[PDB]
Design a protein around this ligand. Structure first.
Ligand SMILES: Nc1nccc(-c2c(-c3ccc(F)cc3)ncn2C2CCN(Cc3ccon3)CC2)n1
Length: 292
């Protein structure tokens, strides 16, 4: 009975709910399933209107969801996107918090491509985490999508491509678990940083958890300090021990990139492609969740 934008029937909450609650929806016209993000019109720091423009700039790219509608419904700012499947965090949990090397490699390939595509559209994501990557539905079931441009920001001019300046004393924009070491140091995020976080995501998939996860502290501030310290005292070689050398090569390459350097995305994809080949995995999309 409730119809957002006089078109999308509101269904079950999938939520929830910091910066916005997410609801299931159905288009009255097409019959297509949608996802509806709701944001309170009274919040201290608005984001939904800014995020919608970013999404529009990204339109037409592979693994970029299409924004169907923007509106205002009661005391809420409303955004409508095509419905996507479970996130990599949902699937990770569903697979008992361990992925096989084949799955990690299949995911790594598309994830590097999504980050590269955002970078081609003059933005850095700044919140690269498994929760922000979603599988498509039906025939797009094997496609990895990137979402959430809430912390995204321009790294270069749209017209000239002049990179933003180097700056320190920056606040932690994003999740502490996947933040780059340079982000912990208060350094201005750039392209390298999105890929460094990606490397921690892949290692998290490999290990089941990172060495800086589950650290017990007395305050939020004390916990970030513990993560920051743990992450800096953990060398790439210790973190990646017992895993193929490619994960260390990927991480060291990311940390060795200069602030304004254009990353060699092709090389990074090829590292994992070559490993995939050497491992003798079959060239299909039979992920771990398809074997349970
Ligand atoms: N399904 C779907 N399909 C499309 C988008 C979304 C969605 C949106 C969203 C953004 C703009 C918009 F216009 C409509 C919706 N924001 C977050 N999500 C999902 C992120 C992943 N969690 C699950 C989880 C929790 C921890 O780790 N994974 C489920 C909501 N959701």
């Amino acid at each position: 009975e409730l119809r957002v934008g006089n078109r999308y029937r509101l269904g079950r909450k999938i939520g929830s709910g910091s910066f916005g609650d997410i609801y299931l929806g159905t288009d009255i016209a097409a019959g297509e399933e949608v996802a509806i993000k709701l944001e309170c019109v009274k919040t201290k720091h608005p984001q939904l209107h800014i995020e919608s423009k970013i999404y529009k700039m990204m339109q037409g790219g592979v693994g970029i969801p299409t924004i169907r509608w923007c509106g205002a419904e009661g005391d809420y700012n409303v955004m409508v996107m095509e419905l996507l499947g479970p996130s990599l965090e949902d699937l990770f949990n569903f697979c008992s918090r361990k992925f096989s090397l084949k799955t990690v490699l299949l995911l790594a390939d598309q994830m590097i491509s999504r980050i590269e595509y955002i970078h081609s559209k003059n933005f850095i994501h700044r919140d690269v985490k498994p929760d922000n990557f979603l599988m498509g539905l039906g025939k797009k079931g094997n496609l990895v999508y990137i979402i959430d441009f809430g912390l995204a920001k321009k790294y270069r001019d749209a017209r000239t491509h002049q990179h933003i300046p180097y700056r320190e004393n920056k606040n932690l924009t994003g999740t502490a678990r996947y933040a780059s070491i340079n982000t912990h140091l208060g350094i201005e995020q750039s392209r390298r940083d999105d890929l460094e976080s990606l490397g921690y995501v892949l290692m998290y998939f490999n290990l089941g958890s990172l060495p800086w996860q589950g650290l017990k502290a007395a305050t939020k501030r004390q916990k970030y300090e513990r993560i920051s310290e743990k992450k800096m005292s953990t060398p790439i070689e210790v973190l990646c021990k017992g895993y193929p050398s490619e994960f260390a090569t990927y991480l060291n390459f990311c940390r060795s990139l200069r602030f304004d350097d254009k990353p060699d995305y092709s090389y990074l994809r090829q590292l994992f492609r070559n490993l995939f080949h050497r491992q003798g995995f079959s060239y299909d999309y039979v992920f771990d969740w398809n074997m349970l």
